[PDB]
Design a protein around this ligand. Structure first.
Ligand code: SF4
Ligand code: SF4
Ligand code: SF4
Lengths: 628, 628
């Protein structure tokens, strides 16, 4: 089968074959037929009595592990641990952001750039703002956010966009969230040998844990990032590997933590570093981003996006990356080995993400700007080691428009508001187009790449099908970057791919049919948007014609995201089967019984066209339930 | 191979074969040859690009996972997740204890029974005590303990017995602990795909996480349990399955959390329940404990111990267990199936541990005594369903002495203190016998059973070898219960098994050669003891001739325990190989490089006699280093 639908990706794969280096596709081929027990989730290693593998087919073979655990128990515990790991990644990101907020000052490297957003957040956290210094408010807000992570007494703080009905449903179900780290610890405790051996209770614990990601960790990370670095607005950028410059220093920012990439962007305008780039024979400094850190700097500053997850290696294969600076998460360790075949300096910066044989330059949060400057200086000085005979940058780049935060979307919707009617600054125009049926619904396309799927194929096919069916699409993460590379993040795309209702809406509001809402933590924005719509219509989020899709997901973070999206009341389609087919009870809970609990459920569909059809049918069913 | 060295265990295995019921041994046999990849730790399932298996033999076969992770990376992440799971189990136990402390009242079900212990703990937590109400002090202490779990700013609180040198070494190494749930979340975050791919850093993160178990979670759980339920003192009890009564109601308490078992013990003396037991035709109520909850109620009240981990099923096989009340952890789910073959009521009580097809009676912490009375009444009423023709109780039980908390040990040591010299109430006599060489050292024997080892064989052989070599032995958990069943927890055992120096010490102090220090969380007591000795000698804990042994461990909790014991500076022998042989770098870190970091290291030895020899040699070389 084809490795990708992206032509630049294919050219660089040919180059990597010529250079004798191996990619993620080569390692996937080397893995051959993957273990059936692990693929079905019926393998357990939770204690040293094991490893235990039970039959994925009930009634045949070994039925129980040594402790007596059934296939359903093993599957449910494995699924819960995936959710806990994803929640941990997102919560650690949000915790770093909250600590950065706590360390803001007027004359420091980290300031408050959006005071209005900070005051609204302070209102949401019961922090007084009138007649107060802005940094005192910021510190109080950071304290409340940090308490959300580890409070042992009392209730956590949740955003006002979350409907009261959803909160009450969670409380009745027993999944109402506690402090984030406490829920992660609870999930890890209940999967220990000889604890929870009941699939339904295990799934409910995992949902409870995922809620602390969706509504607390990711939400606080996003809102505090907006406070410190600015709320995203409509902004132009370029996407795909063609953004690399042969005649300039190329600095590629990979990872998820935004403070480092923000400081690197600021350092790139330093006169001394620009002069140094000129002195090593380069035209200038060309910052490019990848994955979620690329999404953040692109949403807030228009930094060009070099590529998504499965392109990271190919970025090095060009031979033009002088410095690859990585913080945490979704950083293929093979990059270190790959960097030996080129001049590239592979720089790790976080104590959480040491990588063997990489150059470690710890990013100092006490002096973020100076630390970013020294890291960037190492990248710039590496330009002298460039071998221009090994350089091949495909001439394939695509224009994209992004920056669609909830605030930006509301500002855009204000155009189609009659002044004599109003109100202004609400999601009411979006609610109106959804209720009238001009738009059939809204769908979030999120997730990673996965060698099991032709890279970016499922993302593009799902998005095109949805917008052709007058479903407005919001995108995050690597799916958003696939849309950017393909050319869907363009106003012209409305008349090229969208159906009649969505084309009319795009023309009236002057937006692309596909709205890039940011990184994987920025999925919280999607929740926020949906919540607002629900609160405007006086219904729960499970009554709306909305859906989420993860066509090509790979990470534990994706599992946690899908779990909290379903738990919030939004049906989720998974384009890659999770390792649960071995447990019939777990499959039945996730795809059938979940609808009785939270009004939504998982859909597993590896065919994107069938997924689009199912999404449209489900949205029409919910519309008929709602009367619209 | 023999299944056990215990004769009562063998008789009940014959009965289980005659009854056509499966045991843990039968399921272990059914599992046959366990997966080599999982056994070596070279299998990874951390993302849905996998499952990935790399060769346990370097230089052959597949070398890297799909993301590029090496065998060392996969092994180190798997080990770190085991540590995180064990830390989560212990920390959740301690968190429940702290919450119970927070709800103590003068006229409530949960009171303060050891005010002196509470005042000393309050001193350790910087809580004022002079001229204050005892329950105000208790609530402040509980608040400080709870803050240890989830504080995001500042430093955690550690017991005064921990040497300053050990803390400084931890700070220099980068493993100084943070809040417990924060460290669990950090480990889970760094094992996520594309985060940490460096074995040394991964092992250091796991050590940092395990410290929050050893010195914060388990320590606080133990000390708060002492405050609420009484400090253990020397007390007599009986051990092994013979403690069951044919003519009495048999109520078996299995699990770890002590509040439920304490309330059940209190409810058993209720006049209405005793009258009900008489009216259902029984002579009375016979409470028996298993595993750690049995250890707690036995340490504090002399409740008879029915058996350790791999005996739990056999307790039901007798046909005499009218009620089996379980809370969390090390509860084989197969019990639910097994109790169908008998009249036994298998009662789950904790929302953390639901077991399918068991009778769920949620233990209400708000009204603990009434809830315990209701559960106990269900067990008593089940006596009418006893089938006395199916009853077979082995006439095999053994006298044991336990209750050796640090306070009790100090009280015993006061006997050999010359009044004209002093001081009293210190560990000084123990330090003196260790320094003089009358005792060669002290060894902690802890851990579970494991079907991979003849049950209780390794525990007994290791303990007998150590005490024969004049090494005083402290025991916890299932190892302590194996010693109890065998008969080592007896004063007579001193003249039957101990060497000359240990026999003299036992005669002078009037103690058994093997000291039962309580449950698995009570391993913190061992730490406390060692710390005191170190603080009395002005040395670090790694300079002492001390060791820990886990001859037959199975649980993730055991992994976390061994990790924090080694990190504290105490060499640890493992009688069951952990899944790390696939990663040569991880093996080298755990067994060789750890000594450079923390002055102690792991020893993997499956032969108990060889383990005793190695322990004696290591203790002698540490003595020669210390000059004693
Ligand atoms: S999933 Fe289990 S059975 Fe399959 S290779 Fe991995 S450890 Fe072995
Ligand atoms: S927890 Fe149970 S099923 Fe899992 S490895 Fe241990 S004995 Fe086997
Ligand atoms: S994290 Fe890497 S090694 Fe582990 S399953 Fe995913 S791709 Fe394979």
């Amino acid at each position: 089968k084809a490795k990708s639908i992206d032509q630049a990706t294919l050219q660089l794969l040919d180059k990597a074959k010529q250079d004798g280096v191996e990619t993620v596709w080569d390692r996937k081929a080397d893995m051959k037929v993957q273990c059936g027990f692990g693929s079905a989730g019926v393998c357990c290693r939770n204690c040293s009595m094991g490893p235990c593998r039970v039959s994925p087919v009930p009634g045949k073979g070994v039925e129980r592990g040594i402790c007596g655990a059934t296939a359903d128990v093993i599957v449910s515990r494995n699924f819960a641990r995936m959710v806990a790991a994803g929640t941990a990644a997102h919560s650690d990101h949000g915790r770093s952001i909250a600590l950065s907020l706590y360390h803001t000052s007027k004359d420091g490297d980290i300031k408050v750039k959006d005071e209005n957003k900070l005051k609204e957040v302070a209102k949401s956290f019961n922090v007084e703002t009138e007649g107060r210094d802005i940094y005192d408010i910021a510190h109080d807000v950071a304290k409340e956010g940090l308490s959300n992570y580890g409070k042992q007494l009392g209730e956590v703080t949740l955003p006002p966009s979350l409907p009261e009905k959803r909160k009450e449903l969670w409380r009745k179900l027993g999944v109402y969230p506690r402090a984030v780290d406490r829920e992660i610890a609870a999930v890890m405790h209940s999967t220990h040998i000889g604890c929870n051996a009941d699939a339904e209770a295990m799934i409910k614990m995992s949902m409870r844990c995922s809620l602390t990601d969706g509504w607390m960790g990711s939400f606080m990370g996003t809102e505090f990032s907006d406070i410190m670095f600015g709320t995203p607005h409509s902004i132009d950028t370029e996407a795909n590997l063609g953004v690399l410059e042969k005649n300039s220093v190329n600095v590629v920012l990979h990872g998820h933590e935004p403070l480092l990439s923000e400081m690197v962007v600021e350092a790139a305008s330093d006169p001394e570093l620009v002069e140094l780039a000129k002195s090593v024979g380069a035209d200038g400094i060309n910052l490019c981003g990848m994955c979620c850190t690329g999404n953040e700097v692109s949403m807030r500053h228009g930094i060009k996006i070099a590529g998504n997850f499965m392109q990271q290696e190919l970025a090095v294969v060009t031979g033009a990356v002088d410095g690859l600076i990585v913080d945490v998460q979704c950083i293929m360790p093979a990059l270190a080995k790959l960097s030996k075949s080129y001049h590239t300096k592979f720089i790790t910066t976080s104590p959480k993400a040491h990588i063997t044989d990489s150059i470690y330059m710890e990013f100092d949060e006490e002096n973020p700007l100076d630390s970013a400057k020294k890291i960037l200086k190492e990248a710039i000085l590496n330009f002298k080691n460039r071998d221009q005979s090994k350089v091949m940058i495909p001439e394939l780049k695509c224009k994209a428009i992004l920056g669609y935060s909830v605030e930006e979307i509301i500002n855009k919707l204000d155009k189609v508001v009659n002044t004599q009617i109003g109100p202004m600054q609400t999601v009411k125009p979006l609610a109106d187009v959804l209720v009238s049926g001009v738009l059939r619904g809204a769908a979030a396309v999120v997730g990673c790449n996965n060698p099991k799927v032709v890279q970016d194929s499922a993302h593009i096919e799902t998005i095109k099908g949805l917008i052709k069916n007058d479903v407005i699409v919001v995108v995050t993460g690597c799916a958003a970057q696939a849309a950017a590379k393909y050319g869907l993040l363009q106003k012209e795309a409305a008349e090229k791919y969208a159906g009649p209702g969505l084309a009319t809406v795009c023309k009236l509001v002057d937006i692309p049919p596909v709205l890039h809402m940011g990184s994987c933590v920025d999925i919280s924005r999607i929740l926020d948007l949906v919540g607002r719509v629900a609160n405007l219509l006086g219904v729960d989020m499970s009554d709306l014609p909305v859906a989420g899709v993860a066509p090509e997901w790979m990470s534990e973070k994706a599992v946690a995201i899908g779990t909290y999206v379903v738990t919030s009341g939004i049906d989720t389609w998974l384009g890659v089967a999770p390792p649960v087919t071995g447990g019939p009870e777990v499959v039945d809970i996730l795809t059938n019984k979940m609808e009785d609990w939270v009004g939504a459920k998982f859909f597993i569909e590896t065919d994107p066209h069938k997924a689009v059809e199912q999404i449209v049918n489900r949205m029409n069913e919910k519309r008929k339930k709602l009367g619209i």
